[PDB]
Amino acid sequence: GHMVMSTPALRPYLPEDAAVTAAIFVASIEQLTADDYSEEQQEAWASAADDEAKFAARLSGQLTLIATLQGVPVGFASLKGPDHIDMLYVHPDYVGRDVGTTLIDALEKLAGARGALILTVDASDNAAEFFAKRGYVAKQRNTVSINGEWLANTTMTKSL
């Protein structure tokens, strides 16, 4: 037997959500990535929320959904263009609750409804297994340069 999770509510990202989104993003990175990323890597990755206008522009100019529980934002994800999973960040206090899964299902429905046949994500090493269990297949190991740091990830694709 297994526990049955509730599905969180999802709503589009609003300009007023700028700060809570940046807060979920940095807390998710700090607290959930230690086994695959060193102190300095995590700091460069998180530092993206530093440029507030540009962090908010990336969100507002993409298809960005916010997961809520009791109306409190606990996670968000972002589709870029037709077929890129650009962002997936669940607050560290709310992981293991099918928030990530709910968010990603919404992005795949949204992307299918836009023509896309092959969804793609550059998955962080800690989220690699998560994506693989949902039919994403590792295609290419990469390094990304972020704020003067190098961080590994893997391009993984899913047929819709």
Ligand SMILES: CC(=O)SCCNC(=O)CCNC(=O)[C@H](O)C(C)(C)COP(=O)(O)OP(=O)(O)OC[C@H]1O[C@@H](n2cnc3c(N)ncnc32)[C@H](O)[C@@H]1OP(=O)(O)O
């Ligand atoms: C492009 C990008 O943005 S990639 C970068 C991705 N982001 C990050 O790495 C930031 C740090 N990480 C995170 O924020 C999160 O760990 C995420 C986003 C990867 C996933 O968020 P979560 O809400 O924990 O995902 P969710 O709960 O749907 O599933 C995670 C696991 O918990 C499990 N789970 C869910 N509910 C339960 C439960 N009641 N009992 C046991 N296990 C459970 C799922 O089976 C799943 O297993 P898997 O890892 O084998 O797939």
